[PDB]
């Protein structure tokens, strides 16, 4: 019954909207749910020379790609998560669920 | 025979095997996170992949 919603989004507000619906849905069935944990954000980094050739002032881009990971611990049967998490999807978040 | 010497140079390593997945050229490749993409092509598709210039 140690069910664990691994919420990994590219965006921030789509992850806030998902994790808010995974609490406002869980409460009315009266199951004790731990607050959505924040795992430290992983920023990718690719610095390219802007120029197709190598002629000009040696200027660089700094292409970030911030990634955000959350977990939500659930004290619930293995079936209730299949009912809630299917409702109100949005493509920003990757809503993964671990059994144990 | 012909077919036994046509590609009988090992392609298991080196910059002459791995290539840009758009261009098929072997220079300025982004091997980081397996983009496997020439720096000029990565810039073309920086927006679409999810990369963004905030900083």
């Amino acid at each position: 019954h140690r069910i664990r919603i691994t919420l990994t989004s590219r965006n921030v507000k789509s992850l806030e909207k998902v994790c808010a619906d995974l609490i406002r849905g869980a409460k009315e069935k009266n199951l004790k749910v731990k607050g959505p944990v924040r795992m430290p954000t992983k920023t990718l980094r690719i610095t390219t020379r802007k120029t197709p050739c190598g002629e000009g002032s040696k200027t660089w881009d700094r292409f970030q790609m911030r990634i955000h990971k959350r977990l939500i611990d659930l004290h619930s049967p293995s079936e209730i998560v299949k009912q809630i998490t299917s409702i109100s999807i949005e493509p920003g978040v990757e809503v993964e669920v671990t059994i144990a | 025979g012909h077919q036994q010497l046509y590609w009988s140079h090992p392609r298991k390593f080196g910059q002459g095997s791995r290539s840009c997945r758009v261009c098929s050229n072997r220079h300025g490749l982004i091997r980081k996170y397996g983009l496997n993409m020439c720096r000029q092509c990565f810039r073309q598709y920086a927006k679409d992949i999810g990369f963004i210039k905030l900083d």
């Binding site: 990994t8 590219r10 992983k42 990718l44 790609m65 990634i67 990971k69 990757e94 | 997945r21 996170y33 397996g34 983009l35 993409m37 598709y45 679409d48 992949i49 999810g50 990369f51």
Partner: peptide, 19 residues
């Protein structure tokens, strides 16, 4: 997954796909 690629590379293999 059988190969089980990292979440760093999950958003890159999927980003390339979108592009």
């Amino acid at each position: 997954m059988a190969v089980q690629i990292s979440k760093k590379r999950k958003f890159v293999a999927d980003g390339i796909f979108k592009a």
